Amino acid sequence: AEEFPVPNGFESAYREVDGVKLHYVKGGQGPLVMLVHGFGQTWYEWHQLMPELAKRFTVIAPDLPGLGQSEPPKTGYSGEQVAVYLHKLARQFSPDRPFDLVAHDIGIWNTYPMVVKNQADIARLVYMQAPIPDARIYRFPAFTAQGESLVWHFSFFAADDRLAETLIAGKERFFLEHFIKSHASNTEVFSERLLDLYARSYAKPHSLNASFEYYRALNESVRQNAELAKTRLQMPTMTLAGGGHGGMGTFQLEQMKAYAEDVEGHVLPGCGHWLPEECAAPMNRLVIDFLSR
Amino acid sequence: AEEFPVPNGFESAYREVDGVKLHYVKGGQGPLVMLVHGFGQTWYEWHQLMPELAKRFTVIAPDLPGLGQSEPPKTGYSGEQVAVYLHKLARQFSPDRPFDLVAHDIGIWNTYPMVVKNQADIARLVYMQAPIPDARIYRFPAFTAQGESLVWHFSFFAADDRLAETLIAGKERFFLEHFIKSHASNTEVFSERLLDLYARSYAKPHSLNASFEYYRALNESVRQNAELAKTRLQMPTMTLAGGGHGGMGTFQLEQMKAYAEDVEGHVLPGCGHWLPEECAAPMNRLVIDFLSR
Numbered sequence A, B: 001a002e003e004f005p006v007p008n009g010f011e012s013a014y015r016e017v018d019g020v021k022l023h024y025v026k027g028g029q030g031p032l033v034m035l036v037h038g039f040g041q042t043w044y045e046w047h048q049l050m051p052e053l054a055k056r057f058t059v060i061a062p063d064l065p066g067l068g069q070s071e072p073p074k075t076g077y078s079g080e081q082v083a084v085y086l087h088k089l090a091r092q093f094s095p096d097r098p099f100d101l102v103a104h105d106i107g108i109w110n111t112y113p114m115v116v117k118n119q120a121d122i123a124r125l126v127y128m129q130a131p132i133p134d135a136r137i138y139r140f141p142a143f144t145a146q147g148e149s150l151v152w153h154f155s156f157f158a159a160d161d162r163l164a165e166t167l168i169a170g171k172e173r174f175f176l177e178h179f180i181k182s183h184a185s186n187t188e189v190f191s192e193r194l195l196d197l198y199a200r201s202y203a204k205p206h207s208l209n210a211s212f213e214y215y216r217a218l219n220e221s222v223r224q225n226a227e228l229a230k231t232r233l234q235m236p237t238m239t240l241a242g243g244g245h246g247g248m249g250t251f252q253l254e255q256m257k258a259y260a261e262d263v264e265g266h267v268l269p270g271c272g273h274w275l276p277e278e279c280a281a282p283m284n285r286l287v288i289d290f291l292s293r
């Protein structure tokens, strides 16, 4: 049984990494690129970009531990702990060469530590629509004069006594449509059919809980990154952000400049958080062009 | 039936104000003091203060429109609209002399406009544990280095799609215990029975919705207060705030200094947000002494 349709020419498979069975979808030939999804979604957010990349790269899209069809982590949900699983997974398929990395939303949180600790393994890096966890997140406002705070879900999801799982259980499809559309500019791409697929996956009880454990570990991840960030990233990096409702605008690039020596950034107008779906054509073009250099 | 026990010597009653049937509890003799409750609670949060105050004053504690046993407003939930109902209710009982006002949490939001517009009607003012809605609220951080913030509920409650009602329905007692304890220093003062009573009141579907409509109107109240605040408050004012977890500390007095010419403030160590319950004895003493001068 597959939660999402595999593109033609790709395989759905599993690999045990440090005692955790990870699900992934893989296709193509050539140097490896790993695509890492974020909250509310799975490998499937990449399914339009994957066939295009697979024309010249080997492409792997895993499900984050506990999400999609991947088992929960055995160590923990902090960025440094999860990053181990993803780094070892990639190195099973690229043991002798650097690989490229694309990450969205908490995919950034779950990859930054292995990038900074294994810089020679990362050829090129693309990050979109999430802050790297650091002290900047403690200044984001809870409440805005216009639109909506992009950030109040940090506290909701991190609240103790399983607040979020307890309130959302039984209402998963409702909640997912609300939080996806509230963070989108081009809401019309989120058909009821597509929302059904995403909701069915994260409504699995262990996946609902896993989703929020990433936020419960966020303060730990901030403390981890305070040490890791004493070394800047050296490899070519590109940031993408939406310029519309739900987009991070100029923050994505401006923060990355503190972390990276070689970075270019783009803000996609009329696009919110969910760039692969809201703005597939320009986003795919930017990623393919950047990795094809 | 009554949702909460009425103290001896007090009456539970109703008055029509602008076509809206308001519930209140009233007792005592002498000049009028109106006590206005906040979110999650009803008139009952004042039940320990009321018998003491009624030795020197006529005391009235209404349920906010839509909450407790009061009918929802027929105009709207912004501060200026709700303050009309509370001002006219007070004037029914004190038509010939100014009255005192004590307000907690969103009771502040729902009274500040009628105080500033009807200053000759207000003898003395006591405000505790909430910002006056203004641009200062756009600074409060969404997330803290210790976990969930005190203010992310602004955005949870203001969200559309009836987000809060939909997620909290069926879990009203669970959610109320969470937000009471997350804003408390002294959780021991909240019996399981007291939490049961508050939860059963705000779980009423029109009351659960009314609770969050105050927040859906918050930005409108900010915009209203931007104009109203061009007129400073001239009556004697006291602020109170908790010094412990859940307390606003020095913010309460420091903001009030920008609104009021004649203000004194106290911060109560060992107390959080729920001052009438967490710190009943010192809070009652400070209020009684301030109003008795």
Ligand SMILES: *[C@H](C/C=C\CC)[C@H](O)C/C=C\C/C=C\C/C=C\C/C=C\CCC(=O)O
Binding pocket: A038, A039, A040, A105, A106, A129, A130, A131, A139, A140, A141, A150, A151, A153, A179, A183, A248, A251, A273
């Ligand atoms: C995934 C969000 C997906 C769905 C929400 C339910 C991650 O949790 C969050 C990723 C991105 C948004 C988070 C924070 C936004 C980052 C910066 C805020 C924008 C400008 C900052 C302005 C300032 O300095 O205050």
Ligand SMILES: *[C@H](C/C=C\CC)[C@H](O)C/C=C\C/C=C\C/C=C\C/C=C\CCC(=O)O
Binding pocket: B038, B039, B040, B105, B106, B129, B130, B131, B140, B150, B151, B153, B179, B183, B246, B247, B248, B251, B273
């Ligand atoms: C009622 C809060 C009641 C229940 C919480 C669901 C109002 O919505 C909020 C009023 C007071 C809540 C207490 C503290 C937060 C309010 C303002 C923040 C002021 C200063 C910052 C202090 C801090 O965050 O440490």
